Structures are given as C-alpha cells and as structure tokens.
Copies of this chain bind each other. A is one copy, B any other.
Amino acid sequence: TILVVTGTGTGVGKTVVCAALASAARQAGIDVAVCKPVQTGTARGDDDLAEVGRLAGVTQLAGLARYPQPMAPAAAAEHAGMALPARDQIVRLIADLDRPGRLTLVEGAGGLLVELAEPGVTLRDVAVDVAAAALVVVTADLGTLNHTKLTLEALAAQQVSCAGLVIGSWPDPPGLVAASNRSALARIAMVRAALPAGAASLDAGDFAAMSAAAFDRNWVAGLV
C-alpha cells in the first residue's frame, strides 16, 4: 500500500499535501508512514519530514540524505561533492516501511522526473519498482493544465497508475482562471482535494480539521 506524492513542479504545495493526506488517513484510523529519501535546501530551513510530523503527527518518518543547497538533488549532490543514494537503497527502504493496514507515502523532490538516485533514477522508476500509484499535486494557476498533462503522460508512459490530483493551494477568492482550471482539471482526472490557500500556516489542530474535511473519507479509507 504505497502512494508516491509528486508535483507538477516545485513549490506547488506538495509537502503540505502529503501532510494533509497523512492527517486525513490518521483520522480514518489508518497507520501512516512518510518516506522522503532525498531532501534538499536544508540550510535555508527545509526539512520536509519534520514539517509533516509537526502538521500531521506522523511518527514514522524515513529519509536517506539531506543536502543544504536549494537545488535539484543531483545538482545539490554535485555541489556538495557527495553522491546520491542508490536505487536499491531507496526501494528497499520503502518496501520495509510497507505494512498491513498502513498507508505508506513517498514524497519526491519535488517533480516526477527529478533524478533521486544513482544513476539518473527518478521517482517514476521508484514508483515502478514498488508498484506504487502516484498522487499528483497541481496548482490552480495559468499553466497548470500543460504541467498536469505532461506529468500524467509521463506516468502512463511507464504504466504508473494515476491515483488522482490534489490542488496544493486553492485561492480566496478563486478568480476566473483558478475557477476555470478547477473544472478543466476535473475533466482530466479525479481531483481528490483542493487545499485552502494558507493551510501551511495552521496549528496542528486546525490542520487536522482542514484535512479531515479536504479529502473524501471513503476514498482515503479505500487506499488501505
């Protein structure tokens, strides 16, 4: 029972979506682990797993490498002078997390075709190895339709199942494009949730309630 969580790009609200799904799943009595093998941009304050523990109360938080530079992992590794983890290292970590009645989320860094492991292995390759489906995090902004469609093509090209879309940030008030994009994205795939703009600044209690309301309970329960 593994879902990778990937974005159409960087800064679409992916980590916060992982947290919101984790919270929703915890509230349906499901055990959650979140694995983020590679993390970059630590020295500017980024630790995505810690963000997920804080916001969602997840305790099973697995990772393998953290790079200080705010770059793609490969770039960050080349700059640090320290290789990336190995493909087998990543896959085995995720397989060991996997438990009955457990939702295991694997968060990429951040986009689908970013190299995560040696040599040139992507989150798509990992999804394939572990037979995971992919939840795609999207924006509601202009440009999202091309990015969503590009990602969904890349998924289907290697036969990784789409498990749906989440809009990482839903503006208030929406606007004509956001409003339109929401309908358009619902014609391309199932939108599992649209997280209210600003959800990242919520305390643990408000975040949990936002999460329980954001997802369809039956869908979430269904994952396991």
A79 CB to nearest B CB, Å: 7
Given contacts A176-B79, A180-B79, contact A9 B70 (CB under 8 A): no
Q: Is the CB of A150 within 8 A of B75?
A: no
Interface hub of A115, A142, A146 (most chain B Cβ within 10 A): A146
Q: Which residues of B contact A154 (CB under 8 A)?
A: 150, 153-154
A136 CB to nearest B CB, Å: 12
Q: Is the CB of B143 within 8 A of A110?
A: yes
Q: Which residues of B contact A161 (CB under 8 A)?
A: none
Q: Which residues of B contact A143 (CB under 8 A)?
A: 9-11, 110-111
Given contacts A110-B146, A151-B150, contact A75 B11 (CB under 8 A): no
Give chain A interface residues in 67-119, CB to chain B under 8 Å: 69-72, 74-75, 78-79, 110-115
| 22 sample A-B contacts, Cβ–Cβ < 8 Å, listed by A number | A9-B146, A9-B147, A10-B143, A10-B146, A69-B176, A71-B176, A71-B177, A72-B142, A72-B146, A72-B184, A75-B180, A110-B143, A112-B146, A113-B145, A113-B146, A113-B149, A113-B153, A114-B146, A147-B150, A150-B153, A153-B153, A153-B157
